[PDB]
């Protein structure tokens, strides 16, 4: 770890600076260094970690989709052979994406999840584990694709079970987990009905618990509820 000589607090400070500068690769490297100090992460620190890698892998996914699209067109009936370059470069981006996912999954496995006992940390990390297996699933095509999908499903399911036992239905982590697990069902597991059912049930159970919330908590919960509705509108 090239961050091994930097103070934990300095790594966290620099992650926040990197965020302000929209330097998300740096942000992720700083937060990886912080995780590798071995201490548990606070709520703010967990979100710094997730923001950083979400931005990095999000850009990789967008690039992969562009390149995969070009590659599919190059392979349709009527196309002029352009050689191996599109496939090679898509593979290059894909391998870098898989590397980032493996890095995040490695941090969760060593040893963030095993030390996470509170629902807010444990559900957060298991959601991340589902998310990064989901991103691996998006590009998977080999002997391992079903197993990658089942790893995502298993992580999401454990997170779901904890969240339903330990968090209110408006908890934004619970809502965001359900949002993403619903997308997993629709886009990865070829289970659009499960996706729609989960989004709708999550939305309705949250709606009924909004009356308990402060104005600030209401704003946080209704924001994610609107994303659930947005997806439901996309899918029906």
């Amino acid at each position: 770890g090239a961050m091994g000589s930097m103070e934990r607090a300095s790594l966290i400070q620099k992650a926040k600076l990197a965020e302000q500068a929209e330097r998300y690769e740096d942000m992720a490297a700083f937060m990886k260094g912080a995780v590798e100090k071995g201490e548990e992460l606070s709520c703010e620190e967990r979100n710094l970690l997730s923001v950083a890698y979400k931005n990095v892998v999000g850009g990789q996914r967008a690039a992969w989709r562009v390149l995969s699209s070009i590659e599919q067109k190059s392979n349709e009936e009527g196309s002029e052979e352009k050689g191996p370059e599109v496939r090679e470069y898509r593979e290059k981006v894909e391998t870098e994406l898989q590397g980032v996912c493996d890095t995040v999954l490695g941090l969760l496995d060593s040893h963030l999840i095993k030390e996470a006992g509170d629902a807010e940390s444990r559900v957060f990390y298991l959601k991340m584990k589902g998310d990064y297996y989901r991103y691996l699933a998006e590009v998977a095509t080999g002997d391992d694709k079903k197993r990658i999908i089942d790893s995502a499903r298993s992580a999401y399911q454990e997170a779901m079970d904890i969240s339903k036992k330990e968090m209110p239905p408006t908890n934004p982590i619970r809502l965001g987990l359900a949002l993403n697990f619903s997308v997993f069902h629709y886009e990865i597991a070829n289970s659009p009905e499960e996706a729609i059912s989960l989004a709708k049930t999550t939305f309705d159970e949250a709606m009924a618990d909004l009356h308990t919330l402060s104005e600030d908590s209401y704003k946080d919960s209704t924001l994610i509820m609107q994303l659930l509705r947005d997806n439901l509108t996309l899918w029906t």
Binding site: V183, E187, L234
Partner: peptide
């Protein structure tokens, strides 16, 4: 693409 957080 659908929304995720």
């Amino acid at each position: 693409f659908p929304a995720t957080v």
